[PDB]
Each structure stands twice: as C-alpha cells, then as structure tokens.
C-alpha cells in the first residue's frame, strides 16, 4: 500500500 | 454452533433493538446466537467490525436512493438520497450512532464512483461534489442523532414546560416540536440544495 | 465530603476526558470526588442530568458567539456562532455525544430570545429563523460527531488504503482527508448560509 | 403547566 487516509466522509 | 453472515447480522440487529448500542457487545451476541466466542471471531473480530457490518446492512435494506437514478436532476438525486439515508438510520434503535465512523467497503465503490461522476457531469467540480455529499451526510446524521437522543432522554428527565419562556423562543420551540423531525430535516436539506445551486451557478 | 457545582463539574469533565462518555457514570464520579453517592444525588440526580450540566458548562467556557454581536450581519452571526459551538463540542473527549439531546435552562432564555429577535429583525420569518438555527446546529453536531468517531475507530480497525479505489472516489476521499475536518465544516456551513440568503431574498 | 414539548432543536 502507498496511501492511507484517517478521516472519511459519512457513508451514504 | 454454525455461523454465516446472515445469521450473525440478523441476531445482532435484533439485539441492537433490545439493548441499544451501548448494550450491544460481541459476547452478548455470541450468547444470543448460542455459539462460543471464537466461532464468532471469524465473522466479527470486535465491536467496531460488528457496527460496520450492521451499518452496511441497514443501507443494503433501506437506502433505496444510494445511487443516482436516470434521468434525475442533481437536486432530486441529493434530496432523495438524503431521505433514503435517513430512513436507513431510523430503521433500528440507535441506528445513526451505529453508522458514525463507517467506512465503505469495495462493494460500494461502484455506487460511490457513480455519485461523483453524476455530479461532476452536472457541472460540479470534484471538490464541490465531495463537499455537497459530505454536507448532506453530516446534516442528516446530526438530524437523526439529535431526534433519537431526545427520544431517549424523556425516560430520564422531567418533561419541560414551555409556559415561562419569552415569546419568540416559546413560539419557535413549540413550532419545532409541533411540526416534528421530518419537516426540520426537509427544511435544512432544502437550504443546503439552494446553497449548492447558488455556488454552482457561480463557478460556471 | 462536600460538594458544589464547580467541584462536581470540574471532576466530571476530567473523568470524561479519561474514560469517554460510555465510561462516565455517577458512581465513578462519586468515587473520583471521594464522596458517598447520596451527597452527589443532590447535585446530579442521574447520568442524564450530569450530561446536561457538562454540555452547559462547555458552552459557558467556549461558546463565545452564543449571542449575536452588534453590529454583525446575520450571515456573520450564523458563521461565528457555528464556529464557536463547534469549539465547545471539541473541547472535551466525546463532547458532541455529551451535547446530544441537551435542553436549555432558564439562564439561556435571554440569549436564545435575542438570537431570534435579531434574525427576524433581519427579515427572517420566525419559522425560517428557527430552522436556520436548527440546520446550523444539526450540521455542526453531525460534523463533529463523525470527526470524533473516525478518530476513535482508528485504534479498532485496519487503516484503509485508498490505492484500489476508482479514480473520482480515490481523489475525493484523499482530498477530504487532506483538507481535514475544518474545511469540510466551513464548506457545508457556507452552503447553508448561501441557501438561507436565497430563501430570504424570496420571501421579501 | 399547560404546554410541554418532547423534541427540541440542538442548543447553541
């Protein structure tokens, strides 16, 4: 893996 | 003694309705399932994983407007999507707390790519499409979370008289309770969509 | 052995930061206070009452734009109020969960009447002022609740790679994480204010 | 008391 994120928008 | 996705998720959603999100634990679920905990581990590694599975199931059952519909306007897509999302969050006790912090899995990627393709084809920048969808999601979560909590708090607190409030606050609070959860959600949703329209017209 | 408002609320906010909202109970608080539970009862009758006291304290400390400022525009009042409210919710661990379901007490009535008087004097109907404030409150809660939860979930879940997502979703998710919580909150807040402006211009 | 409500807007 190269890129990870730590915050996501709500899923909908 | 034996598990599969459907058995574990159906039992967990009934437990959620019986005990609420704080009451829900993997141990209590294994017990309801009549299984030992290591069998359950292969299906849900911990609480967090269980919550995520339950949030996805509620969307699979009730989020009918997850994806844009041909040939919807973007405004109708955003309104219908929000309404559908709301229905999923209200489907079970503490449903919106279950949904907080959920991550998409690979099976939603096609849906989520289509939402963005659709909005950008409507003239949104990628960034503006992302934050129109984010703002709708955050407002809808907030709405349901606040609704669901006042409901709980009423078993726990003296029910407040509005009699002694000053006149505008009295009228506003009585009106907010009178019209109820859905009109407040629809009013905010409409204000968001109007704002998106204004910003889009600028831009281009 | 002896209690007063300030002693109980300061100890409770430190316990909230140590154990989070589920960890917080009146019994654990009495213990931290070195008091027996019936002494504590006269100050907080149950968990619900404790939460409400803690939410009001966080606003008393950090919600600097609770009330309109002379001679702010309504748009600046709504933006500043939301930013101030957000800062109160972020002041403590699980602060926005603490705030869900909170009721005003009599000491906020003057403030809340002034917000409404101010908006209606700006040309809002009473109903539209109520739902502009509601929508700002619900969006801000949702925003902070989702932020605060992703933060927790990271100790609990494999941190997700975006590498394999389709191109628009990959770009949107990477951008949302890159720009972070405050830009997403400000973008939604601005879209709400633009929508309020559009609706107000109609009306009159 | 004459009037009570069961839902309130968020306090802020």
CSV table of C-alpha atoms in Angstrom, one decimal:
chain,number,residue,atom,x,y,z
A,1,UNK,CA,0.0,0.0,0.0
A,2,UNK,CA,1.1,3.6,-0.7
A,3,UNK,CA,-1.7,5.8,0.6
A,4,UNK,CA,-4.0,5.6,3.6
A,5,UNK,CA,-6.5,8.1,5.0
A,6,UNK,CA,-7.5,8.7,8.7
A,7,UNK,CA,-10.8,10.6,8.1
A,8,UNK,CA,-13.7,9.7,5.7
A,9,UNK,CA,-16.9,11.4,4.9
A,10,UNK,CA,-20.1,9.8,6.1
A,11,UNK,CA,-21.1,6.7,4.0
A,12,UNK,CA,-24.3,7.2,2.0
B,1,UNK,CA,-22.8,-23.8,16.6
B,2,UNK,CA,-22.6,-22.7,13.0
B,3,UNK,CA,-22.4,-19.1,11.6
B,4,UNK,CA,-22.7,-17.2,8.4
B,5,UNK,CA,-23.1,-13.5,7.6
B,6,UNK,CA,-26.9,-13.5,7.6
B,7,UNK,CA,-27.3,-15.4,10.9
B,8,UNK,CA,-24.9,-13.2,12.8
B,9,UNK,CA,-26.3,-9.8,11.3
B,10,UNK,CA,-30.0,-10.8,11.9
B,11,UNK,CA,-29.3,-11.7,15.5
B,12,UNK,CA,-27.2,-8.6,16.1
B,13,UNK,CA,-29.9,-6.2,14.7
B,14,UNK,CA,-32.5,-7.8,17.0
B,15,UNK,CA,-30.1,-7.4,19.9
B,16,UNK,CA,-29.5,-3.7,18.9
B,17,UNK,CA,-33.2,-3.1,19.1
B,18,UNK,CA,-33.5,-4.9,22.5
B,19,UNK,CA,-30.5,-3.2,24.3
B,20,UNK,CA,-29.3,-0.3,22.1
B,21,UNK,CA,-25.8,0.4,21.0
B,22,UNK,CA,-24.1,0.6,24.4
B,23,UNK,CA,-25.9,-2.7,25.4
B,24,UNK,CA,-24.5,-4.4,22.3
B,25,UNK,CA,-21.4,-6.4,22.8
B,26,UNK,CA,-19.8,-9.4,20.9
B,27,UNK,CA,-20.1,-11.5,24.0
B,28,UNK,CA,-23.9,-10.9,24.3
B,29,UNK,CA,-24.3,-11.6,20.6
B,30,UNK,CA,-22.4,-14.9,20.8
B,31,UNK,CA,-24.8,-15.8,23.7
B,32,UNK,CA,-27.9,-14.9,21.7
B,33,UNK,CA,-26.5,-17.0,18.8
B,34,UNK,CA,-25.8,-20.0,21.1
B,35,UNK,CA,-22.2,-20.0,19.9
B,36,UNK,CA,-18.8,-19.9,21.6
B,37,UNK,CA,-16.9,-16.6,21.0
B,38,UNK,CA,-14.0,-18.0,18.8
B,39,UNK,CA,-16.6,-19.1,16.2
B,40,UNK,CA,-18.0,-15.6,16.2
B,41,UNK,CA,-14.5,-14.0,15.9
B,42,UNK,CA,-14.1,-15.3,12.3
B,43,UNK,CA,-17.2,-13.3,11.4
B,44,UNK,CA,-16.8,-10.2,13.6
B,45,UNK,CA,-13.3,-9.6,15.1
B,46,UNK,CA,-14.6,-6.9,17.5
B,47,UNK,CA,-17.3,-4.4,18.2
B,48,UNK,CA,-16.1,-2.0,15.7
B,49,UNK,CA,-16.3,-4.6,12.9
B,50,UNK,CA,-19.8,-5.5,14.1
B,51,UNK,CA,-21.0,-2.0,14.0
B,52,UNK,CA,-19.6,-1.5,10.5
B,53,UNK,CA,-21.5,-4.7,9.3
B,54,UNK,CA,-24.7,-3.5,10.8
B,55,UNK,CA,-24.4,-0.1,9.2
B,56,UNK,CA,-23.9,-1.6,5.8
B,57,UNK,CA,-26.8,-4.0,6.2
B,58,UNK,CA,-29.1,-1.2,7.1
B,59,UNK,CA,-28.1,0.6,3.9
B,60,UNK,CA,-28.5,-2.6,1.9
B,61,UNK,CA,-32.1,-3.0,3.2
B,62,UNK,CA,-33.3,0.6,3.3
B,63,UNK,CA,-31.0,3.0,1.3
B,64,UNK,CA,-33.0,2.8,-1.9
B,65,UNK,CA,-31.6,6.1,-3.4
B,66,UNK,CA,-27.9,5.2,-2.7
B,67,UNK,CA,-27.2,5.6,-6.4
B,68,UNK,CA,-28.5,8.4,-8.8
B,69,UNK,CA,-31.5,7.4,-10.9
B,70,UNK,CA,-31.6,8.1,-14.7
B,71,UNK,CA,-32.7,10.8,-15.5
B,72,UNK,CA,-32.9,12.6,-12.1
B,73,UNK,CA,-31.9,16.2,-11.7
B,74,UNK,CA,-28.9,16.5,-9.3
B,75,UNK,CA,-31.2,18.4,-6.9
B,76,UNK,CA,-33.7,15.5,-6.8
B,77,UNK,CA,-30.9,13.0,-6.5
B,78,UNK,CA,-29.4,14.8,-3.5
B,79,UNK,CA,-32.9,15.2,-1.8
B,80,UNK,CA,-33.9,11.5,-2.5
B,81,UNK,CA,-30.5,10.2,-1.4
B,82,UNK,CA,-30.8,12.1,1.9
B,83,UNK,CA,-34.3,10.9,2.5
B,84,UNK,CA,-33.3,7.3,1.8
B,85,UNK,CA,-30.2,7.6,4.1
B,86,UNK,CA,-32.3,9.0,6.8
B,87,UNK,CA,-34.7,6.0,6.5
B,88,UNK,CA,-31.8,3.6,6.9
B,89,UNK,CA,-30.5,5.4,10.0
B,90,UNK,CA,-34.1,5.3,11.6
B,91,UNK,CA,-34.6,1.6,10.8
B,92,UNK,CA,-33.2,0.4,14.1
B,93,UNK,CA,-32.7,1.7,17.6
B,94,UNK,CA,-29.5,3.9,17.8
B,95,UNK,CA,-29.1,3.4,14.1
B,96,UNK,CA,-27.3,6.7,13.5
B,97,UNK,CA,-24.8,6.0,16.4
B,98,UNK,CA,-24.2,2.6,14.6
B,99,UNK,CA,-23.4,4.5,11.4
B,100,UNK,CA,-20.9,7.1,12.8
B,101,UNK,CA,-17.4,6.4,11.6
B,102,UNK,CA,-18.4,3.7,9.0
B,103,UNK,CA,-16.0,3.1,6.1
B,104,UNK,CA,-17.1,2.0,2.6
B,105,UNK,CA,-16.0,-1.5,1.5
B,106,UNK,CA,-15.1,-2.4,-2.0
B,107,UNK,CA,-18.8,-3.5,-2.8
B,108,UNK,CA,-19.9,0.2,-2.5
B,109,UNK,CA,-17.1,1.6,-4.7
B,110,UNK,CA,-19.1,1.4,-8.0
B,111,UNK,CA,-22.1,3.2,-6.4
B,112,UNK,CA,-19.9,5.9,-4.9
B,113,UNK,CA,-18.0,6.5,-8.2
B,114,UNK,CA,-21.3,6.9,-10.0
B,115,UNK,CA,-22.5,9.5,-7.5
B,116,UNK,CA,-19.4,11.6,-8.2
B,117,UNK,CA,-19.4,11.0,-12.0
B,118,UNK,CA,-23.0,12.1,-12.0
B,119,UNK,CA,-22.5,15.3,-10.0
B,120,UNK,CA,-19.4,16.4,-12.0
B,121,UNK,CA,-21.2,15.7,-15.2
B,122,UNK,CA,-23.8,18.1,-13.9
B,123,UNK,CA,-21.1,20.8,-13.6
B,124,UNK,CA,-19.8,20.4,-10.1
B,125,UNK,CA,-16.0,20.4,-9.5
B,126,UNK,CA,-14.8,17.1,-7.9
B,127,UNK,CA,-14.2,19.1,-4.7
B,128,UNK,CA,-17.6,20.7,-4.7
B,129,UNK,CA,-19.3,17.3,-5.4
B,130,UNK,CA,-17.4,15.8,-2.5
B,131,UNK,CA,-18.5,18.5,0.0
B,132,UNK,CA,-22.1,18.7,-1.3
B,133,UNK,CA,-22.3,15.0,-0.5
B,134,UNK,CA,-20.4,15.4,2.8
B,135,UNK,CA,-22.6,18.3,4.0
B,136,UNK,CA,-25.8,16.3,3.2
B,137,UNK,CA,-24.4,13.3,5.1
B,138,UNK,CA,-23.3,15.3,8.2
B,139,UNK,CA,-26.6,17.3,8.3
B,140,UNK,CA,-28.7,14.1,8.0
B,141,UNK,CA,-26.6,12.2,10.7
B,142,UNK,CA,-26.9,15.3,13.0
B,143,UNK,CA,-30.6,15.5,12.4
B,144,UNK,CA,-31.3,11.8,13.2
B,145,UNK,CA,-28.8,11.7,16.1
B,146,UNK,CA,-30.5,14.6,17.9
B,147,UNK,CA,-34.1,13.2,17.2
B,148,UNK,CA,-33.1,9.7,18.5
B,149,UNK,CA,-31.5,11.2,21.7
B,150,UNK,CA,-34.4,13.5,22.7
B,151,UNK,CA,-36.5,10.3,22.4
B,152,UNK,CA,-34.2,8.5,24.9
B,153,UNK,CA,-33.8,11.4,27.3
B,154,UNK,CA,-37.5,11.6,28.0
B,155,UNK,CA,-37.5,8.5,30.2
B,156,UNK,CA,-34.7,10.2,32.1
B,157,UNK,CA,-35.5,13.9,32.7
B,158,UNK,CA,-38.6,16.0,33.8
B,159,UNK,CA,-40.5,16.9,30.6
B,160,UNK,CA,-40.1,20.6,30.1
B,161,UNK,CA,-42.9,23.2,30.2
B,162,UNK,CA,-42.5,26.0,27.6
B,163,UNK,CA,-45.0,28.2,29.5
B,164,UNK,CA,-42.4,30.5,31.0
B,165,UNK,CA,-40.2,31.1,28.0
B,166,UNK,CA,-40.0,34.6,26.4
B,167,UNK,CA,-42.5,34.9,23.4
B,168,UNK,CA,-40.2,34.3,20.3
B,169,UNK,CA,-38.4,31.3,21.9
B,170,UNK,CA,-41.7,29.9,23.2
B,171,UNK,CA,-43.2,30.1,19.7
B,172,UNK,CA,-40.1,28.7,18.0
B,173,UNK,CA,-39.7,25.8,20.4
B,174,UNK,CA,-43.5,24.9,20.3
B,175,UNK,CA,-43.4,25.1,16.5
B,176,UNK,CA,-40.2,22.9,16.2
B,177,UNK,CA,-41.9,20.2,18.3
B,178,UNK,CA,-45.3,20.6,16.6
B,179,UNK,CA,-44.0,20.2,13.1
B,180,UNK,CA,-41.6,17.4,14.2
B,181,UNK,CA,-38.5,15.7,12.9
B,182,UNK,CA,-39.3,15.3,9.2
B,183,UNK,CA,-40.2,19.0,8.5
B,184,UNK,CA,-37.0,20.1,10.3
B,185,UNK,CA,-34.9,17.7,8.2
B,186,UNK,CA,-36.6,18.7,4.9
B,187,UNK,CA,-36.1,22.5,5.6
B,188,UNK,CA,-32.4,22.1,6.3
B,189,UNK,CA,-32.0,19.7,3.3
B,190,UNK,CA,-33.7,22.3,1.0
B,191,UNK,CA,-31.5,25.1,2.4
B,192,UNK,CA,-28.4,23.0,1.5
B,193,UNK,CA,-29.7,22.3,-2.0
B,194,UNK,CA,-30.4,26.0,-2.6
B,195,UNK,CA,-26.9,26.9,-1.4
B,196,UNK,CA,-25.4,24.2,-3.8
B,197,UNK,CA,-27.4,25.8,-6.7
B,198,UNK,CA,-26.1,29.3,-6.0
B,199,UNK,CA,-22.5,28.1,-5.8
B,200,UNK,CA,-22.8,26.0,-8.9
B,201,UNK,CA,-24.2,28.9,-10.9
B,202,UNK,CA,-21.2,30.9,-9.9
B,203,UNK,CA,-18.2,28.6,-10.8
B,204,UNK,CA,-19.7,28.3,-14.3
C,1,UNK,CA,-17.3,15.0,51.6
C,2,UNK,CA,-18.6,18.4,50.5
C,3,UNK,CA,-19.9,19.3,47.0
C,4,UNK,CA,-20.9,22.4,45.0
C,5,UNK,CA,-21.5,22.9,41.3
C,6,UNK,CA,-17.9,23.8,40.4
C,7,UNK,CA,-16.3,20.8,42.2
C,8,UNK,CA,-18.6,18.2,40.7
C,9,UNK,CA,-18.5,19.7,37.1
C,10,UNK,CA,-14.6,20.0,37.1
C,11,UNK,CA,-14.1,16.4,38.3
C,12,UNK,CA,-16.7,15.1,35.8
C,13,UNK,CA,-15.1,16.9,32.8
C,14,UNK,CA,-11.7,15.4,33.8
C,15,UNK,CA,-13.3,11.9,34.1
C,16,UNK,CA,-15.0,12.4,30.7
C,17,UNK,CA,-11.5,13.0,29.1
C,18,UNK,CA,-10.1,9.9,31.0
C,19,UNK,CA,-12.8,7.4,30.1
C,20,UNK,CA,-15.1,8.9,27.5
C,21,UNK,CA,-18.9,9.2,27.6
C,22,UNK,CA,-19.7,5.5,28.0
C,23,UNK,CA,-17.1,5.2,30.8
C,24,UNK,CA,-18.7,8.1,32.7
C,25,UNK,CA,-21.1,7.1,35.4
C,26,UNK,CA,-22.4,8.8,38.6
C,27,UNK,CA,-20.8,6.1,40.7
C,28,UNK,CA,-17.3,6.6,39.1
C,29,UNK,CA,-17.7,10.3,39.6
C,30,UNK,CA,-18.7,10.0,43.3
C,31,UNK,CA,-15.5,7.9,43.7
C,32,UNK,CA,-13.3,10.4,42.0
C,33,UNK,CA,-14.8,13.1,44.2
C,34,UNK,CA,-14.2,11.0,47.4
C,35,UNK,CA,-17.9,11.3,48.2
C,36,UNK,CA,-20.7,8.9,49.0
C,37,UNK,CA,-23.5,8.7,46.3
C,38,UNK,CA,-26.4,10.3,48.2
C,39,UNK,CA,-24.3,13.6,48.6
C,40,UNK,CA,-23.8,13.5,44.9
C,41,UNK,CA,-27.5,12.9,44.2
C,42,UNK,CA,-28.5,16.4,45.4
C,43,UNK,CA,-26.2,17.8,42.6
C,44,UNK,CA,-26.8,15.3,39.8
C,45,UNK,CA,-29.8,13.0,40.1
C,46,UNK,CA,-28.6,10.7,37.3
C,47,UNK,CA,-26.4,10.4,34.2
C,48,UNK,CA,-28.8,12.4,32.1
C,49,UNK,CA,-28.6,15.4,34.5
C,50,UNK,CA,-24.8,15.1,34.6
C,51,UNK,CA,-24.5,15.1,30.8
C,52,UNK,CA,-26.8,18.2,30.6
C,53,UNK,CA,-24.6,20.1,33.2
C,54,UNK,CA,-21.5,19.2,31.3
C,55,UNK,CA,-22.9,20.3,28.0
C,56,UNK,CA,-23.9,23.7,29.5
C,57,UNK,CA,-20.5,24.1,31.1
C,58,UNK,CA,-18.7,23.5,27.8
C,59,UNK,CA,-20.9,26.3,26.3
C,60,UNK,CA,-20.3,28.6,29.2
C,61,UNK,CA,-16.5,28.2,28.7
C,62,UNK,CA,-16.1,28.1,25.0
C,63,UNK,CA,-19.2,29.2,23.1
C,64,UNK,CA,-18.1,32.8,22.7
C,65,UNK,CA,-20.6,33.6,19.9
C,66,UNK,CA,-23.7,32.2,21.6
C,67,UNK,CA,-25.3,35.6,21.2
C,68,UNK,CA,-25.3,38.0,18.2
C,69,UNK,CA,-22.8,40.8,18.4
C,70,UNK,CA,-23.7,44.4,17.5
C,71,UNK,CA,-23.4,45.2,14.6
C,72,UNK,CA,-22.8,41.8,12.9
C,73,UNK,CA,-24.5,40.8,9.7
C,74,UNK,CA,-26.9,37.8,10.2
C,75,UNK,CA,-24.5,35.8,7.9
C,76,UNK,CA,-21.5,36.6,10.1
C,77,UNK,CA,-23.5,35.9,13.2
C,78,UNK,CA,-24.6,32.4,11.9
C,79,UNK,CA,-21.0,31.6,10.8
C,80,UNK,CA,-19.4,32.8,14.0
C,81,UNK,CA,-22.0,31.1,16.2
C,82,UNK,CA,-21.4,27.8,14.4
C,83,UNK,CA,-17.6,28.1,14.7
C,84,UNK,CA,-18.0,28.9,18.5
C,85,UNK,CA,-20.4,26.0,19.0
C,86,UNK,CA,-18.0,23.6,17.2
C,87,UNK,CA,-15.2,24.7,19.5
C,88,UNK,CA,-17.3,23.9,22.6
C,89,UNK,CA,-18.2,20.4,21.2
C,90,UNK,CA,-14.4,19.8,20.5
C,91,UNK,CA,-13.3,21.0,24.0
C,92,UNK,CA,-13.6,17.6,25.6
C,93,UNK,CA,-13.5,13.9,24.6
C,94,UNK,CA,-16.9,12.8,23.2
C,95,UNK,CA,-18.1,16.3,23.7
C,96,UNK,CA,-20.6,16.3,20.9
C,97,UNK,CA,-22.2,12.9,22.2
C,98,UNK,CA,-22.4,14.9,25.6
C,99,UNK,CA,-24.3,17.6,23.9
C,100,UNK,CA,-26.9,15.5,22.0
C,101,UNK,CA,-30.4,15.9,23.5
C,102,UNK,CA,-29.5,18.9,25.8
C,103,UNK,CA,-32.3,21.2,26.9
C,104,UNK,CA,-31.9,24.9,27.5
C,105,UNK,CA,-32.4,26.1,31.1
C,106,UNK,CA,-33.8,29.4,32.1
C,107,UNK,CA,-30.4,31.1,32.2
C,108,UNK,CA,-30.1,30.7,28.4
C,109,UNK,CA,-33.5,32.1,27.6
C,110,UNK,CA,-32.4,35.7,27.2
C,111,UNK,CA,-29.6,34.6,24.8
C,112,UNK,CA,-31.9,32.4,22.8
C,113,UNK,CA,-34.6,35.2,22.6
C,114,UNK,CA,-32.0,37.6,21.3
C,115,UNK,CA,-30.9,35.2,18.6
C,116,UNK,CA,-34.5,35.0,17.3
C,117,UNK,CA,-35.2,38.8,17.7
C,118,UNK,CA,-32.0,39.5,15.7
C,119,UNK,CA,-32.8,37.2,12.8
C,120,UNK,CA,-36.5,38.3,12.5
C,121,UNK,CA,-35.3,41.9,12.6
C,122,UNK,CA,-33.1,40.9,9.7
C,123,UNK,CA,-36.2,39.9,7.7
C,124,UNK,CA,-36.5,36.1,8.6
C,125,UNK,CA,-39.9,34.7,9.4
C,126,UNK,CA,-40.0,33.2,13.0
C,127,UNK,CA,-40.2,29.8,11.4
C,128,UNK,CA,-37.3,30.4,9.0
C,129,UNK,CA,-35.1,31.8,11.8
C,130,UNK,CA,-35.9,28.7,13.9
C,131,UNK,CA,-34.9,26.3,11.1
C,132,UNK,CA,-31.8,28.3,10.0
C,133,UNK,CA,-30.6,27.9,13.5
C,134,UNK,CA,-31.7,24.2,13.7
C,135,UNK,CA,-30.0,23.4,10.5
C,136,UNK,CA,-26.7,25.0,11.5
C,137,UNK,CA,-26.9,23.1,14.9
C,138,UNK,CA,-27.6,19.7,13.3
C,139,UNK,CA,-24.9,20.1,10.6
C,140,UNK,CA,-22.4,21.2,13.2
C,141,UNK,CA,-23.2,18.2,15.6
C,142,UNK,CA,-23.1,15.8,12.7
C,143,UNK,CA,-19.7,17.2,11.5
C,144,UNK,CA,-18.1,16.9,15.0
C,145,UNK,CA,-19.7,13.5,15.8
C,146,UNK,CA,-18.4,12.0,12.6
C,147,UNK,CA,-14.9,13.6,13.1
C,148,UNK,CA,-14.7,12.4,16.8
C,149,UNK,CA,-15.8,8.8,15.8
C,150,UNK,CA,-13.2,8.3,12.9
C,151,UNK,CA,-10.7,9.3,15.5
C,152,UNK,CA,-11.8,6.6,17.9
C,153,UNK,CA,-12.3,3.9,15.2
C,154,UNK,CA,-8.6,4.0,14.2
C,155,UNK,CA,-7.5,2.2,17.3
C,156,UNK,CA,-10.0,-0.5,16.4
C,157,UNK,CA,-9.9,-1.2,12.6
C,158,UNK,CA,-7.2,-1.8,9.9
C,159,UNK,CA,-6.4,1.7,8.4
C,160,UNK,CA,-7.8,1.7,4.9
C,161,UNK,CA,-5.7,2.0,1.7
C,162,UNK,CA,-7.2,4.2,-1.0
C,163,UNK,CA,-4.9,2.7,-3.7
C,164,UNK,CA,-7.6,0.5,-5.2
C,165,UNK,CA,-10.5,2.8,-5.4
C,166,UNK,CA,-11.8,4.1,-8.7
C,167,UNK,CA,-10.3,7.5,-9.8
C,168,UNK,CA,-13.0,10.0,-8.7
C,169,UNK,CA,-13.8,8.3,-5.4
C,170,UNK,CA,-10.0,8.0,-4.7
C,171,UNK,CA,-9.4,11.7,-5.5
C,172,UNK,CA,-12.5,12.7,-3.3
C,173,UNK,CA,-11.6,10.6,-0.3
C,174,UNK,CA,-7.9,11.6,-0.4
C,175,UNK,CA,-8.9,15.3,-0.7
C,176,UNK,CA,-11.5,15.1,2.2
C,177,UNK,CA,-8.8,13.6,4.5
C,178,UNK,CA,-6.1,16.0,3.2
C,179,UNK,CA,-8.0,19.2,3.8
C,180,UNK,CA,-9.4,17.8,7.1
C,181,UNK,CA,-12.3,18.5,9.5
C,182,UNK,CA,-12.3,22.3,9.5
C,183,UNK,CA,-12.5,22.9,5.7
C,184,UNK,CA,-15.3,20.3,5.4
C,185,UNK,CA,-17.2,22.1,8.2
C,186,UNK,CA,-16.7,25.5,6.7
C,187,UNK,CA,-17.8,24.4,3.2
C,188,UNK,CA,-21.1,22.9,4.5
C,189,UNK,CA,-21.6,26.0,6.8
C,190,UNK,CA,-21.1,28.3,3.7
C,191,UNK,CA,-23.5,26.3,1.6
C,192,UNK,CA,-26.2,26.6,4.4
C,193,UNK,CA,-25.7,30.4,4.6
C,194,UNK,CA,-26.0,30.8,0.8
C,195,UNK,CA,-29.1,28.8,0.9
C,196,UNK,CA,-30.6,31.0,3.7
C,197,UNK,CA,-29.7,34.1,1.6
C,198,UNK,CA,-31.6,32.8,-1.4
C,199,UNK,CA,-34.7,31.9,0.6
C,200,UNK,CA,-34.7,35.2,2.5
C,201,UNK,CA,-34.4,37.2,-0.8
C,202,UNK,CA,-37.5,35.3,-2.0
C,203,UNK,CA,-40.0,35.7,1.0
C,204,UNK,CA,-39.4,39.5,0.7
D,1,UNK,CA,-48.2,23.8,33.5
D,2,UNK,CA,-50.2,23.9,30.3
D,3,UNK,CA,-47.8,23.1,27.4
D,4,UNK,CA,-44.8,20.7,27.2
D,5,UNK,CA,-42.7,19.7,24.2
D,6,UNK,CA,-41.0,16.3,23.6
D,7,UNK,CA,-38.4,17.4,20.9
D,8,UNK,CA,-36.1,20.4,20.9
D,9,UNK,CA,-33.6,21.8,18.5
D,10,UNK,CA,-29.9,21.5,19.4
D,11,UNK,CA,-28.8,24.0,22.0
D,12,UNK,CA,-26.4,26.6,20.7
